[PDB]
Amino acid sequence: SSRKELANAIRALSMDAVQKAKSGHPGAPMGMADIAEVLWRDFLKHNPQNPSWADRDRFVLSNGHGSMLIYSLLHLTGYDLPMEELKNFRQLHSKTPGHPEVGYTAGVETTTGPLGQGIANAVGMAIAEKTLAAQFNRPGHDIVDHYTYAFMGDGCMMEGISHEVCSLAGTLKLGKLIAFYDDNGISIDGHVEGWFTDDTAMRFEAYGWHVIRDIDGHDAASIKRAVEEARAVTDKPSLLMCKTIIGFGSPNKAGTHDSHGAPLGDAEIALTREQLGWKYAPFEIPSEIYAQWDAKEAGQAKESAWNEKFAAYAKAYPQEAAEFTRRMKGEMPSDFDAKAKEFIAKLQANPAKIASRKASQNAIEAFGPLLPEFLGGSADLAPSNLTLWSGSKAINEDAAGNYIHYGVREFGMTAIANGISLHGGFLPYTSTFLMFVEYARNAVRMAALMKQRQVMVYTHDSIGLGEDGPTHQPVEQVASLRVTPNMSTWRPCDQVESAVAWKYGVERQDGPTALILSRQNLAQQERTEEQLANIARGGYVLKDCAGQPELIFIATGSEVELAVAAYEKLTAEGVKARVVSMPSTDAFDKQDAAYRESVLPKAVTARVAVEAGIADYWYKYVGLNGAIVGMTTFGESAPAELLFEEFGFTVDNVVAKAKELLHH
Amino acid sequence: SSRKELANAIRALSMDAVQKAKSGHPGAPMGMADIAEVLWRDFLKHNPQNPSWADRDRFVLSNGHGSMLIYSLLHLTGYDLPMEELKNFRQLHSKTPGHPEVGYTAGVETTTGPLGQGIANAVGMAIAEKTLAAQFNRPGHDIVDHYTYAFMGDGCMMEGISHEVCSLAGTLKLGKLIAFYDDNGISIDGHVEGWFTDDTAMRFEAYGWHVIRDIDGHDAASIKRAVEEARAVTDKPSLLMCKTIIGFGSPNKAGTHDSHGAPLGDAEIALTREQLGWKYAPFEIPSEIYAQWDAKEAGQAKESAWNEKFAAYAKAYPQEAAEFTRRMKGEMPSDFDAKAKEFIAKLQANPAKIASRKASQNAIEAFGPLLPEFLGGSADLAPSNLTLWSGSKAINEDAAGNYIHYGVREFGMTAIANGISLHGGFLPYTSTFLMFVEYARNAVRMAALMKQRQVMVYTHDSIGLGEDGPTHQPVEQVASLRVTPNMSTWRPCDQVESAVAWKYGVERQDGPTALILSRQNLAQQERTEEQLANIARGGYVLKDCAGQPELIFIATGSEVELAVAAYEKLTAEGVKARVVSMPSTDAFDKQDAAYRESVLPKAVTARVAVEAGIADYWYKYVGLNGAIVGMTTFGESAPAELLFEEFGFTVDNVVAKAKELLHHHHH
């Protein structure tokens, strides 16, 4: 068959699957099919029989609404994605959700949809390949060597995150990153000139990319030559400016916004079949077309050749090969748990009053030698977030390093780190001031949705940061993290809880962990062995009474010391008081009911929550018959001590609120 | 005095104020002082005695950590910002907070700090000036004519939001926007080449800006020439790339990251005075330097001339002049309240089962003729968010229009709209799918912090959107808005609540209002006159029983219909039940204790919340002895009706959960 006919198989499957679902996006798949045919058939290195092959090329669809493009490609090339799944596009529990999801579908590398994040993930995958190659390749043994290809459209280009990640990709000279821009002139509001007029090629040259202008995206020869040129440029990422017609093939809807996001309609599909010369019924693909698209034979040959290369590497570099396998599987060192517990015990035995930002740095220092998979960084806040340890080596200085200077790019950093975690081989950590989680907020959500391990180091957690004032002082950010599905959030009260939280984060296998860390020094609490072991349960009894409590304080982070002081004053008066430290609500909620009852007995309604964050969260644990010593407003610019007084974080106020609650 | 001596007054006040506070940022004020001296003394059109003059130039410090720069300028030029306030930099309830805050300080135009948002606000101020000029100027009467000047640094340039807003500024040919880039080579991690290597000039060329390269930012004559050039270019925004030395004047810290964000130290300040030739003690400024910096006489003259221009305009164009004054003051038309109430009453009397996105469009259509100040838009989702009405006119087509095609730029859109609201003359509305509030999330917070009026139209609010799936289906986003100080969030259950929420939003002068709107059609509920009036109280009794209820359902948005159906089933079985519609938790919480008790009586603990959003929020209203029919997970890609079934939003499940709750209460 001709290359145009092979590409038209994508067009047919895509328009027909959208039509059957009565939902979805035919335009971009139809517009990009010729580009996809060249990339996938002539260049992409992959094995449909093993989508997890460590050295495969990675493909990312940043314009993820065009999901039928990737489903068509996966089906045609021989992945485990049968025609009946394409006939179930957008249907409950199918392998073909409306935007592609990692884990749902063989061969999907990332979850896209939210514009701009796919290209960010691709930048992270390319950073991962470059760094892993530098760490593991040896003379005569280049076990890491693969490309990262991304498709993206006008939406991704308009989004700010594209500026963040493509600027950084230029600095890092990511020569194996090749992006294809679907330059079709159309967005949802219509012809893009009314709102998008950049000289995109000039912009990307300003980032230090190699840019190929004016590619005819409907001409295989033009596309193929451009990809060859891009592959030959090894010191710069490449952008291929592909001029396409959205909805290519449709007489009446090609080149129109109408083709973006609704079924074409039966009559228009019939006219499109006529225009394309496509004679096959919906969901019919002839054996000649499968034979030319199928990648099983070539893919298995390429993966087998790589396996033989890896076996030879392992004979010359046995310890390195074992590390490669461990890290690509995402497994932890066998002795990590024991060594981390030893560190935690040493902290409990040797008290220190330090900020939890510093306790975090100390945990990175302790873990660093044990976790060569770390690939950490901060968004231009290394000396403030405290993300460097003695063994940090920045990848802009040493490609085999373990640290990224992300610049002032919080959203891009977080979505890059999602690509790093998706790639395999690394454990990313990212960092900024907690307030600026709001810049990165949807990438944090995406880490949780995609079940990715990433430690998110968020310092300067409250009014305790002081004079920088209300634009910087978090109030409501922790509450929002706490209610995000699959997110783990820890607000440690001292250096011991900080180390436990770090351990919890690195040991997660199926989602991210946010650490909520202080600028100001935090006192260390005394703990029994049982209490020390129970920090990891997220909530535990720190101070107690004999018998059933009359009053329970629930406190987190920097406010535990305040709650303890109130407990001491009320205990001396003869109140049966308790203090619960709640560093992680999510870990606590996952405990068994007997444990939760032992900490927060259901019969004890006189509960006082104490936290320098938004009060409304705490109704979850205090109900309607308790009290909350929290924030209800933005902060103010002043020294931290005076802010804690101004906002009621005083022993007198905590005691008064407890007494008012006990007097009923 | 020489220009350098006058600039050195800024350097002295800035380093000394930081030193006294033992906190703050001396580097950027010291690096930009010469640029500021030229801009403020030779070009800026302003009156220190009236910071609210409608036609003043607007200045924005996007690198807001350099707050002592703006406090020095305001003090030296004669604003009501006494030296004692500079001595109280970063102290509780001073007029000199660590990052500048609009409202705290005479002459501060916006609250900055969070990088990139100041340049976005400036783009919005420049859009506002261009649009207002096109709407109001008449032949011989150019009553709107002012510049927007912004300072920004490497951090703002790295941030994605700068790409969004500067790309759009290029499309809109904002010739009165002039930005100065503090190109000093330093960020917090050190020398920026390790992480920031853009050819920034070429980037801005790609946006359609007029770029002036390689300006010596310590040479007044060079700066002045560059500003003159930028003013002469009327068809492009301008970027002045000013090469500066961070901490200029400090022998040991100039050009270093150490100068960014800590006091220089007393010993270093002494050496800096010696290098600069600045002899005056901390907080000392001689009368001769005030005489050269003061802007009161020139500012009076400029505003007086403008007032005479406006008087001539008002004689020739009396109705237009009255509209200009009304809109610049942020006042509403005198008949708006009555006309909006008439619309709301007509909707209650004439049911329609439509999506609340459509009810929103219908409210825009109804209000549009009454509110010529609207300056609305969507982030490339006009046909989905339903933000156009018959009178919309995009400003890229006609500069006197009322609508902005923002493109796929949610964060930039929202921070531009903050600039629009700060400028005066307009009532902005912005729009995207609710999920993508997460892209714009800190700009929403900034609108709340700055007490700005903006209506945020967030459609596709739940799993009810269907097949687009979990990356698009909000779950926890509304709860995040609900816990934001000074935010107002409305999740209307029908077209009537939607119109009430729109009215509330446009009439809310001291903060923003988010509308949480459905893709799918919503049933209209029956209401008495009192219930209709009670929608605006945020939470109200929609269905009731005689005597104390056994059970109270609390529901919002699309789930009110489900809660009412469950109420009807249980009522028919003899259960004493009540339904509370809670379109706005923030408005409900602001009602007095007696009203809140009347809706959610403390004696009734068997409370069932029903909302297709994160369950954990609802403990606030149901306590520990109730039930929540909510989401606890991400969504799924499927038809909406199957998702509602899958996730338990069915009459059978709500009734079962309510009966299970009652069984537990009884035993």
Ligand SMILES: COc1ncc(C[n+]2csc(CCOP(=O)(O)OP(=O)(O)O)c2C)c(N)n1
């Ligand atoms: C912030 O994140 C975000 N915001 C909005 C949308 C909705 N949306 C999908 S596509 C597109 C605009 C056009 O995107 P574009 O790639 O040009 O596509 P085609 O129409 O296929 O050419 C828009 C506006 C999204 N998915 N993600």
Ligand SMILES: COc1ncc(C[n+]2csc(CCOP(=O)(O)OP(=O)(O)O)c2C)c(N)n1
């Ligand atoms: C997302 O929002 C955000 N993130 C981080 C910061 C902290 N910060 C202030 S400044 C700067 C980096 C350097 O900013 P830059 O203008 O080059 O300054 P100078 O050091 O004065 O040259 C950084 C990193 C902020 N305020 N806002």
Ligand SMILES: O=C(CO)[C@@H](O)[C@H](O)COP(=O)(O)O
């Ligand atoms: O610019 C910033 C914050 O935006 C920093 O310079 C801080 O203002 C001070 O840093 P720390 O002393 O809190 O680490």
Ligand SMILES: O=C(CO)[C@@H](O)[C@H](O)COP(=O)(O)O
């Ligand atoms: O691209 C998008 C959403 O990201 C749109 O095309 C929607 O997928 C369909 O729009 P509505 O029918 O919900 O308005």
Ligand SMILES: [Ca+2]
């Ligand atoms: Ca497009």
Ligand SMILES: [Ca+2]
């Ligand atoms: Ca700088």
Ligand code: NA
């Ligand atoms: Na290349």
Ligand code: NA
């Ligand atoms: Na100009």
